[PDB]
Amino acid sequence: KLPEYNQLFPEPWDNFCRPGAIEALDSPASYLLDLY
Amino acid sequence: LLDTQVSAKVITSRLSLVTQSVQQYINRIALNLEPGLSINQQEATDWEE
């Protein structure tokens, strides 16, 4: 209804991980894993 | 419509502070945030202008 970011993009924030963590889809660890 | 987290380092006039709060209220309703109290197109334009 009201105009706000999440209202425009309804999405559970819990469906995202914190940036910088190992859990990051682009963590340097993830890069290493891909390489491996 | 007032900020509680200001530090003691800040001083202001009573009038100015009130004005600030009023402006906040105006902007919020203009931003269509409070329930009801819509604003005409020109009316809003005048404000935001």
**Residue A28 CA: distances (Å) to CA of A16, A23, B10, B29, B43:** 18, 11, 44, 46, 53
The type of residue at B7 is S
Query: Which method resolved this structure?
Result: cryo-EM
Q: Yes or no: say if B33 and B47 are a contact pair by the CB < 8 Å rule.
A: no
**Most B CBs within 10 Å, among A1, A2, A4, A5, to test the B interface:** A2
Q: What share of chain B is helix, strand, coil (3-state, %, to 5)?
A: 50, 0, 50
Structure tokens at B9: 């380092």
Chain B residues with CB under 8 Å of A7 CB are none
Q: How far apart are the C-alpha atoms of B43 and B30, rounded to whole Å?
A: 10
Q: Which residue is listed with tokens 């202001």? A: B12
Q: Yes or no: say if A19 and A11 are a contact pair by the CB < 8 Å rule.
A: no
Closest CA–CA distance from residue B33 to any residue of chain A (Å): 7
Residue of B nearest to A4 (CA): B33
DSSP string, A2-33: ---HHHHS---GGGSPPTTSTT-TT-HHHHHH
The type of residue at B9 is K
Q: Which residue is listed with tokens 């530090």? A: B7
Q: How far apart are the C-alpha atoms of B40 and B48, rounded to whole Å?
A: 12
Q: What resolution does the deposited structure have, in angstroms? A: 4.6
